[PDB]
């Protein structure tokens, strides 16, 4: 079956700056600003646009050795990012792939909110473990706050 899971998180960074750093250069930043979560980001194919395949390696004492993502869509105008988890990590057994959508929306105070949508493709009637859904939420926020701290400490960056 297909199971959807959504999340919203708040950031002080405005939408235009956050999209450039967190989405367009998240692959560059994540090994640098969050070494405890991402050890290395490795492009397999493409630039980073649609059709791009990337191998994300996790540091030692890892829940998963690696994971492979496919970039599905990058909408600069609407601050919308689509990618799919297709190999490694939780992929296998009863879980076929994970379809993800991230949309950054400007907020009335000058900040932004991230609308994360996680779409899991499971085996027949099987269901996903709540820890799997929880772990993805943990990973996203830690990366966001690490990039958020980087931008605040580097006011010239992405601006």
């Amino acid at each position, epitope marked *: 079956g297909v199971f959807n899971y959504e999340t919203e998180t708040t950031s002080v960074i405005p939408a235009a700056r956050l999209f450039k750093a967190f989405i*367009l250069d998240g692959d560059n930043l994540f090994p640098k600003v969050a070494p405890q979560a991402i050890s290395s980001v*490795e*492009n*397999i*194919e*493409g*630039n*980073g*646009g*649609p*059709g*791009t*395949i990337k191998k994300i390696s996790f540091p030692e004492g890892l829940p998963f050795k690696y994971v492979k993502d496919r970039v599905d869509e990058v909408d600069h105008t609407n601050f919308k990012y689509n990618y799919s988890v297709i190999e490694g990590g939780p992929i296998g057994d009863t879980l076929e792939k994970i379809s993800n959508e991230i949309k950054i929306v400007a907020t009335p105070d000058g900040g932004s909110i991230l609308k994360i949508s996680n779409k899991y493709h499971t085996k027949g009637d099987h269901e996903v473990k709540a820890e799997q859904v929880k772990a993805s939420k943990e990973m996203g926020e830690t990366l966001l706050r690490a990039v958020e701290s980087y931008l605040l400490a580097h006011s010239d960056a992405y601006n």
Partner: antibody, heavy 120, light 109 residues
Framework: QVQLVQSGAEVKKPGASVKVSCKASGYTFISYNIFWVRQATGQGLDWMGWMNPFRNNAGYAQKFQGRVTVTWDTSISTAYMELSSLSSEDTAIYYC?????????????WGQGTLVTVSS | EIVLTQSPGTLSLSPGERATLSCRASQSVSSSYLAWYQQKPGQAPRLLIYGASSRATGIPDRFSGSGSGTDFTLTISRLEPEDFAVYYCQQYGSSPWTFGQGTKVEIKR
């Protein structure tokens, strides 16, 4: 099927500039990088510079020393390379090659070659 | 740069024989990031073994690659008349990316 079709033979006087085109087809143009590689029979292969149509930036080989300029037209999926200040040492065949990935930089598909002859 | 030295400059062999081509790197090439290309006179290079051991699509099984660190090899288990050409090795483990000078596989009589 991915193809890289280049413009044809150029004959130039020394001191002039040559602009070679490389039209890509069979894939999304902005999704892959394209390098330019010279092949003169003197040496083997030398990369000249690379374009990144998704990040809108470029990098250049040191040996050619800023005589290489890479531009592109996404609307027609065509990559351009202009080699300014042409001498008789620049007589060679120039190739355009698609980079497979920004980290897996192996050129899966290659252009057919463009001959540039710069003699007086 | 990582300078790639290929040996021998010319390899002379008969059809059906094993061909072993060497690509020595001045520095260690990370993750076995080295590729092999085939080029015939008047033609563009064609991708072959990549990742130092992985075949490109359309490449027959007689082409195989091996090695790690500073030494990589390209093996043609059984040469055929279509296999006599110049082969190049290309590393992409460290920027900037460099090629070898070329090893020519020659017919022999």
């Amino acid at each position: 099927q991915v193809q890289l079709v280049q413009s044809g033979a150029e004959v130039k006087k020394p001191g002039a500039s040559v602009k070679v085109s490389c039209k890509a087809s069979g894939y999304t143009f902005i999704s892959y990088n394209i390098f330019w590689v010279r092949q003169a029979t003197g040496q083997g292969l030398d990369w000249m510079g690379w374009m990144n149509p998704f990040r809108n930036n470029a990098g250049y080989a040191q040996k050619f020393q800023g005589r290489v300029t890479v531009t592109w037209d996404t609307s027609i999926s065509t990559a351009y390379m202009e080699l300014s200040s042409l001498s008789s040492e620049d007589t060679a065949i120039y190739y355009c090659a698609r980079e497979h990935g920004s980290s897996w930089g192996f050129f899966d598909y290659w252009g057919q070659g463009t001959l540039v002859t710069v003699s007086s | 740069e990582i300078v790639l030295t290929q040996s021998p400059g010319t390899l002379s062999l008969s059809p059906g024989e094993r061909a072993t081509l060497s690509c020595r790197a001045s520095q260690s090439v990370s993750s076995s990031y080295l590729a092999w290309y085939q080029q015939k006179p008047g033609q563009a290079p064609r991708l072959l073994i990549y990742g130092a051991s992985s075949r490109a699509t359309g490449i027959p099984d007689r082409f195989s690659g091996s090695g790690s660190g500073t030494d990589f090899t390209l093996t043609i288990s059984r040469l055929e008349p279509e296999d006599f050409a110049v082969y190049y090795c290309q590393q992409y483990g460290s920027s900037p990316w460099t090629f070898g000078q070329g090893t020519k596989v020659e017919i022999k009589r």
